[PDB]
Amino acid sequence: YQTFFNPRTFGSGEADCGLRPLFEKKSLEDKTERELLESYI
Amino acid sequence: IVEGSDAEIGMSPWQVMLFRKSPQELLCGASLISDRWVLTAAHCLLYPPWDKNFTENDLLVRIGKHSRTRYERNIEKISMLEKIYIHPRYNWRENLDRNIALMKLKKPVAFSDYIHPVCLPDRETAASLLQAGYKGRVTGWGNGQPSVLQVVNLPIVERPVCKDSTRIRITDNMFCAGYKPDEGKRGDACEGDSGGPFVMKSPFNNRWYQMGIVSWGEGCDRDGKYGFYTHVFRLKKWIQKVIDQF
Ligand SMILES: *[C@@H]1O[C@H](CO)[C@@H](O)[C@H](O)[C@H]1NC(C)=O
Numbered sequence A: 001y002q003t004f005f006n007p008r009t010f011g012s013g014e015a016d017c018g019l020r021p022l023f024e025k026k027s028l029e030d031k032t033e034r035e036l037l038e039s040y041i
Numbered sequence B: 001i002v003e004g005s006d007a008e009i010g011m012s013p014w015q016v017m018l019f020r021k022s023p024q025e026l027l028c029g030a031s032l033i034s035d036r037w038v039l040t041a042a043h044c045l046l047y048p049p050w051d052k053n054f055t056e057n058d059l060l061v062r063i064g065k066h067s068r069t070r071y072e073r074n075i076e077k078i079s080m081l082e083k084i085y086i087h088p089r090y091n092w093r094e095n096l097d098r099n100i101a102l103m104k105l106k107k108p109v110a111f112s113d114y115i116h117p118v119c120l121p122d123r124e125t126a127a128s129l130l131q132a133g134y135k136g137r138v139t140g141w142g143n144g145q146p147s148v149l150q151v152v153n154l155p156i157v158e159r160p161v162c163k164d165s166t167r168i169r170i171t172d173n174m175f176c177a178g179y180k181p182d183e184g185k186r187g188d189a190c191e192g193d194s195g196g197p198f199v200m201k202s203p204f205n206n207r208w209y210q211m212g213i214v215s216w217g218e219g220c221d222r223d224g225k226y227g228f229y230t231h232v233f234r235l236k237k238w239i240q241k242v243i244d245q246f
Helices: A033-039 B123-129 B159-164 B233-243
Strands: B015-020 B025-032 B037-040 B059-063 B077-086 B101-105 B135-140 B150-155 B174-177 B197-201 B208-214 B227-231
Touching (some): B025 B197, B059 B101
Antiparallel strands (some): B015 B059, B135 B150, B208 B227
16 A cells, blocks of 8 residues: 555555557557647657 | 547557436546546536536546547446545536535556556656646547547646636636637547546656546537636645545
8 A cells, every 4th residue: 555545445556557558658659649748858 | 638649559558538327428537546446526526507416326427539430348347336425615607616526436456568557746756747738638539520539738737718718607626728819729638538547757867647637528619718627736735635534
């Protein structure tokens, strides 16, 4: 229980959040994510 | 979604679709934030002017879908809802301030290559990424309508421009995003995308964060206006209070 939400009530998932099994986890990029990252000046 | 492109399989694994049980109809988008909690817009569940006031047993959600019309065997999952919680200060008669709701799944969903939660922003992420010009992403089906999930990337708008684009009284709990009415581009979220997530990818840790919740829309035309989004980071402590008790 070092996460912001208590897993007892939140359930599982917080620690590995936001890393997509088919993209980030495989070092693969989607077709338009560059457009987002390039906008972050 | 209007003027978007085909999303790729597994590209938005936190996307959740909310349906009316009977008669069966797609109502709104939503997002998976854990194996048992889903975030959406309050107006997807409660909007008295249209006689909308759903209870847990009136709805269901489908998770892990890509095709709107094809049933994806052993991929998509369906879940009933145990409880719905709408923000007590949600202002439906005026400006839709605090337009946010949480839904607890009757049973946790199993994560897979197609189902995975999105992150909620921490302070540094919100301060760093929620800036005019920076783009976020919205996903949903096309609307004749669509075959597969569509995606659009939209830039956050300066607050003075948002404020002058509408007669409603905006609050700091919402932000607006979209391209200028000219046509530098003009993809956008639509009515059917209400409740879905507006996500941004942190260049710092490679993770996707849900910065907003698609607010009100009617059709796919805003008559020169910008779509609004509920500011998730500002409502983070409310989300925690509901979950830590629910
Ligand atoms: C029923 O709908 C009314 C009118 O929209 C709303 O004020 C009330 O909170 C709803 N009832 C419950 C307990 O969900």
